[PDB]
Design a protein around this ligand. Structure first.
Ligand SMILES: [Mg+2]
Ligand SMILES: [Mg+2]
Ligand SMILES: [Mg+2]
Ligand SMILES: [Mg+2]
Ligand SMILES: [Mg+2]
Ligand SMILES: [Mg+2]
Ligand SMILES: [Mg+2]
Ligand SMILES: [Mg+2]
Ligand SMILES: [Mg+2]
Ligand SMILES: [Mg+2]
Ligand SMILES: [Mg+2]
Ligand SMILES: [Mg+2]
Ligand SMILES: [Mg+2]
Ligand SMILES: [Mg+2]
Ligand SMILES: [Mg+2]
Lengths: 50, 258, 65, 138, 181
RNA sequence: GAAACUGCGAAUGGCUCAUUAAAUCAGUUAUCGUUUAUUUGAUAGUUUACAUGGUAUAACUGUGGUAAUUCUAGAGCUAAUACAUGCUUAAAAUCUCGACCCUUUGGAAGAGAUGUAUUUAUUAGAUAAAAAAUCAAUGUCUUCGGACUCUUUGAUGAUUCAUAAUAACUUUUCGAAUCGCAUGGCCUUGUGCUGGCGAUGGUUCAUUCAAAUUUCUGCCCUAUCAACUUUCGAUGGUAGGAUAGUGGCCUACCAUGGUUUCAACGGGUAACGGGGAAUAAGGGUUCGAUUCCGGAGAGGGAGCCUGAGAAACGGCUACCA
């Protein structure tokens, strides 16, 4: 039977899914920035050694 | 046998639990969990045989079902949940926080901690590997999978994990001069500083550890856990500070304090 | 040149059926991995058909437009 | 002659693209076994195919490393070595000579005669009795 | 009935071992699936753990890969022509890994026509002119294309995965197997 | 809340020492050679919906058979976290096929495809250290001359490793049609939109309890047992089948190998192995079915369903008694 509890459960699942996706994207972006900064620093050090 | 075992005789149980050999015939078998069977302290033994809060297993079940016990900031209800090294046990009603650390004798010791120090734990990085979709992750000694680690973190390093978020706050590289804690073998519970790591390709690495009393001992690398820099531990250490004392000196100290 | 292929004499009657049946399968929402391979198979069989029949299949797609 | 057999001897998943025709020599894949076991140049520049070769095959050297004296080389691509040792009898406080014959897979990159000293490394079960593979000759 | 234990065999020295124990399930074996050309018949097998295996009792189509052009097309299997392990499989037309089979060339030929505009809109002309350099192929493959049946080698295990994938013989592979044929 | 369906357990525990002489077992290794219910931690915008069927039945009603059993036959009903189906959710990038203006250094509306799972083929997964000339394709830039820098890659002693990418394939999976408690927040006042605390499911990875195989060394008496194994696999190579997986485990073709007076092979064993027990001044000698660990069995052989886990026996089937 279609009852507001079922609608609430469906909506809750959809919201959980979207929120998880966004959080994963944010973590990926942060890691990309960290890797880029480390890479730039290492390249600068290599240039200094030359 | 035709399958996994589900019983544990008292005599076969780990020695360091300190179980009476005549109280019964069986001992708590720790369920599967973060820590290995032989290196874990089930909550029943901790609440009953160490803290003496519960008089028997049924009272322990009564405690757990009330949701008063938290392990690592999460409520557990299994009597035989395998709590182990560096796990934080919080009992809010008593306003008590404990960190499970081996004493010098090699047994889990009831160590009371402040709430702030209870906010985090330490984990030995057992593995560093790329997961699906090219996402690096680290597996620690307690089976925690943490994604997006700091790239400099390598195996055998230590990571300070915040329990609320399950993220790495800081990390310690395994290097000479670092403070380490022995978590296996006859030297279990001792604390010292690294002196040198012998490497043997295709074999077990050995690490030389010098104690504060300048005594030295060699231990397999699997049994070493980096806990901080010399004189600056990242956790509060139990009494004795991991110093092994001879039987004669123990007699002298015992007679003196008495 | 298949052994079970439609004979040239019988093509003219059968091919209009063959063109139309495949058209619906191209309209399957190309959404799941099995369903995506289905669409690729439908379009991949076009070269087997003679060019006039290929022209017929293209004509059907544009009829709705 | 390499291709002396009903099925073609090829290194799995090593593809020589005929169209490009960059080099005359067929592409050859090789690896170093580790533990400081130098891969011989014959393996690198050889033409043999062997799936049980430690340097060119799909077998890894892990576990114990042993040394022995070749005693038999009459079979194809394998040998039997002899490990001798002294067992201690405490009652008589004296030793006794004992020996064990170990079968070992030998890659064609090595040329072994009867009597020479070979060091071998453990690997996965190659055959009913073979669990070692030759890694140095001397 | 079929068991993979090493106990019933003789020792290395030649001694006749005694029966240590009754047979165990974790060391079992099952009947072979002599896959053959025909209308598709595949039945599942519940294996150790929750995993599943697919038994190709009958099959007539497989995906074959042209490695040089790096393509893979689905094609009916004409038959088995030569097998290294045993000729009886060749006589019976049984499909197993490494068996040499004949397959129709129509999808591959059509792909080559479309991609290179040669035989064995300006957009098409531009693409064809760009790719014209790689058009040339081996004469042996072209002769089979003219015949309409290409020689292919099965790289999959029909008795395990339920598939009949393979790749077109080429170069030394094709020369050697043609000599053996 | 009886009964029944569904899920889980019944493979733990308990008993005995028949068989078992490099077998078990002890110590010590390995899985880069594989399965793993469960626990723990991660992890899936890519898949009529105000929510689909009997392609269905139990319990139950009612009519019955047999001397008898935890025997059940016909008919009538009705459910799911059973069974079987099936949608709903951002943007961007990239790669193909490309109408059309146009012959350019071309451009280009549009039409497609991308998560996972399986199968296969191919590609990347760099490096001991420094400089140039050209052929082809061809991209950013300026001071139209030539110029073009910081350019991306983890782990192991070691890999075809982790991971990624390209082209296809699948009686082919998965991506919540499940349940409890409670009624907060936005307003265009609609039983409108949004929303909390939990349970149970689910792909893959890791951890844990485990499982399987496995490297080196070690067993009492017997030489009046000296040669054994190989036809019917014994040793090894190749290819395949099977296995969760390595492997003569089995098949087909090949060679003739493998062990042995440093005792193989055969025989006896009132032989389960060990931690241990007794005695002895020490060496030694004997005992260990028996409180713990490991192995095997359920009257004797043989063979299987289920399930993550059984060759189970307080599960089933034959034969022998
Ligand atoms: Mg190792
Ligand atoms: Mg005997
Ligand atoms: Mg042994
Ligand atoms: Mg359970
Ligand atoms: Mg889970
Ligand atoms: Mg009925
Ligand atoms: Mg044979
Ligand atoms: Mg094989
Ligand atoms: Mg007996
Ligand atoms: Mg005895
Ligand atoms: Mg005993
Ligand atoms: Mg049994
Ligand atoms: Mg009896
Ligand atoms: Mg039985
Ligand atoms: Mg029983």
């Amino acid at each position: 039977l279609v009852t507001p509890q079922r609608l609430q459960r469906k909506r809750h699942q959809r919201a959980l899914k979207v929120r998880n996706a966004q959080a994963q994207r944010e973590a990926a972006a942060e890691y990309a920035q960290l890797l880029a900064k480390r890479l730039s620093e290492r390249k600068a050090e290599k240039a200094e050694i030359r | 046998a035709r399958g996994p075992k589900k019983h544990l005789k008292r005599l076969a149980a780990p020695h360091h639990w300190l179980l009476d050999k005549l109280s019964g015939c069986y001992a708590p078998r720790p369920s599967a969990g973060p820590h290995k069977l032989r290196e874990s302290l089930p909550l029943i033994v901790f609440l009953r045989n160490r803290l003496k809060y519960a008089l028997n297993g049924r009272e322990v079940k009564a405690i757990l079902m009330q949701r008063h016990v938290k392990v690592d900031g999460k409520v557990r209800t299994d009597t035989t949940y395998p709590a182990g090294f560096m796990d934080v046990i919080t009992l809010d009603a008593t306003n008590e926080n404990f960190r499970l650390v081996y004493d010098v004798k090699g047994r889990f010791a009831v160590h009371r901690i402040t709430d702030e120090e209870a906010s985090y734990k330490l984990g030995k990085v057992k593995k560093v590997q790329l997961g699906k979709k090219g996402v690096p992750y680290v597996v620690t000694h307690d089976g925690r999978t943490i994604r997006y680690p700091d790239p400099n973190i390598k195996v055998n390093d230590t990571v300070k994990i915040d329990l609320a978020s399950g993220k790495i706050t800081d990390f310690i590289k395994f290097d000479a001069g670092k403070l380490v804690y022995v978590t296996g073998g006859r030297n279990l519970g001792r604390i010292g500083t690294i002196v040198h790591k012998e490497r043997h390709d295709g074999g077990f690495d050995l690490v030389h550890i010098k104690d504060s009393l300048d005594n030295t001992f060699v231990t397999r690398l699997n049994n070493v856990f980096v806990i901080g820099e010399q004189g600056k531990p990242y956790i509060s250490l139990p009494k004795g500070k991991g110093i092994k004392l001879s039987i004669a000196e123990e007699r002298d100290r015992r007679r003196a304090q008495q | 040149n298949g052994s079970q292929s439609i004979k040239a004499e019988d093509e003219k009657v059968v091919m209009p059926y063959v063109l139309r049946i495949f058209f619906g399968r191209a309209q399957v929402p190309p959404t799941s991995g099995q369903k995506r391979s289905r669409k690729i198979a439908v379009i991949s069989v076009l070269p087997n058909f003679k060019k006039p029949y290929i022209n017929d299949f293209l004509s059907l797609a544009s009829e709705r437009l | 002659t390499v291709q002396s057999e009903r099925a073609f001897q090829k290194q799995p998943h090593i593809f020589n693209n005929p169209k490009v025709k960059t080099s005359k020599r067929t592409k050859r894949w090789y690896k170093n076994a580790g533990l400081g076991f130098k891969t011989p140049k014959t393996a690198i520049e050889g033409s043999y195919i062997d799936k049980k070769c430690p340097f060119t095959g799909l077998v890894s050297i892990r576990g114990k490393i042993l040394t022995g004296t070749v005693v038999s080389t009459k079979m194809h691509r394998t040998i039997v070595i002899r490990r001798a040792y002294l067992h201690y009898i405490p009652k008589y406080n004296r030793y006794e000579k004992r020996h064990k014959n170990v079968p070992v897979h030998v890659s064609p990159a090595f040329r072994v005669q009867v009597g020479d000293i070979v060091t071998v490394g453990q690997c996965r079960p190659i055959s009913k009795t073979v669990r070692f593979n030759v890694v140095k000759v001397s | 009935g079929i068991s993979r234990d090493s106990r019933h065999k003789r020792s290395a020295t030649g001694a006749k071992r005694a029966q240590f124990r009754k047979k165990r399930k974790f060391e079992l074996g099952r009947q072979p699936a002599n896959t053959k050309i025909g209308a598709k018949r595949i039945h599942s097998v519940r294996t150790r753990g929750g995993n599943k295996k697919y038994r190709a009792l009958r099959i007539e189509t497989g995906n074959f890969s042209w490695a040089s052009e790096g393509i893979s097309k689905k094609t009916r299997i004409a038959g088995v022509v030569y097998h290294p392990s045993n000729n009886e499989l060749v006589r019976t037309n049984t499909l197993t890994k490494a068996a040499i089979v004949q397959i129709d060339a129509t999808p591959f030929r059509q792909w080559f026509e479309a991609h290179y505009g040669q035989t064995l809109s300006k957009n098409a002309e531009r693409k064809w002119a760009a790719r014209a350099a790689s058009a040339k192929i081996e004469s042996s493959v072209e002769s089979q294309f003219s015949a309409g049946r290409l020689y292919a080698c099965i790289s999959s295990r029909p008795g395990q995965s339920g598939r009949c994938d393979g790749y077109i013989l080429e170069g030394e592979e094709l020369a050697f197997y043609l000599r053996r044929l």
